[PDB]
Design a protein around this ligand. Structure first.
Ligand SMILES: N=C(N)c1ccc2cc(O)ccc2c1
Length: 247
């Protein structure tokens, strides 16, 4: 997250921290995600596509810091890593950039809701806030495009939804952005998601309920003039989520 503020898991208790076990035993951060029911986390396919083996991954819920344990955290293996069959990547834009992780603990249990662990509501079908609406984004990604390190403390910021029409412009993204994507940005371009924030939530309040409107997907740099953040438009993927979240 470029700009914005530090936070703790209490302020985004659906946030899931996803890590990968290396051949050699070291564990490194991969991507964010969001708990959408006790057993299901939703993230982005591009985070996993290079290493699709579910055994390689660890999911933490209730975690406020990147490389230290947070009191009350829960640790999960990935029982099912579901990538989107229709995912594709061009030079910049990712299409169908959405993924599901079914989580189960070593004790064979799903998430137990707590002060630091809660689900987030999905939107209703094609129901998005109007452009200009303020939404929040959360993650452990870079604080500056030129950073090597990721921040140790969780961060969040506020961006505004941009119309598909404005985002289609040439000096925005041209035809790179589709109706299954949402653009969001700061009017001063001063704050944004960045590398390491992928898979994490864009949350808006809709009919008075906190709603997973977007999933961090891609952008041309970070907090760059005329280059909004691009998010998977969750309200356009409900059939896929429905069809994949059962027995
Ligand atoms: N401008 C963004 N919101 C944005 C989001 C995700 C990104 C992931 C990357 O690997 C590199 C740049 C990124 C930029």
């Amino acid at each position: 997250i470029i700009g914005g503020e530090f936070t703790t898991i209490e302020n985004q208790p659906w946030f899931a921290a996803i890590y990968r076990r290396h051949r050699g035993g070291s564990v490194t951060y991969v991507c964010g995600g969001s708990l959408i029911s006790p057993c299901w986390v939703i993230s982005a396919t591009h985070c996993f596509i290079d290493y699709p083996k579910k055994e390689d991954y660890i999911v933490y819920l209730g975690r406020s810091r990147l490389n230290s344990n947070t009191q009350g955290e829960m640790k999960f293996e990935v029982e099912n890593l579901i990538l989107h069959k229709d995912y594709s990547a061009d030079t910049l834009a990712h299409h169908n950039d959405i993924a599901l992780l079914k989580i189960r603990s070593k004790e064979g249990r799903c998430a137990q809701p707590s002060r630091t662990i809660q689900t987030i509501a999905l939107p209703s079908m094609y129901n998005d806030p109007q452009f200009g609406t303020s939404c929040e984004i959360t993650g452990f990604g870079k604080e500056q495009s030129t950073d090597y390190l990721y921040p140790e403390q969780l961060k969040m910021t506020v961006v505004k939804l941009i119309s598909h029409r404005e985002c289609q412009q040439p000096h925005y993204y041209g035809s790179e952005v589709t109706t299954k994507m949402l653009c969001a940005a700061d009017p001063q371009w001063k704050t944004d998601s960045c590398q390491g924030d992928s898979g994490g939530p864009l949350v808006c309040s809709l009919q008075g309920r906190m709603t997973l409107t977007g999933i961090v997907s891609w952008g041309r740099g970070c907090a760059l003039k005329d280059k909004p953040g691009v998010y998977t438009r969750v309200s356009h993927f409900l059939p896929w989520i429905r069809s994949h979240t059962k027995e």
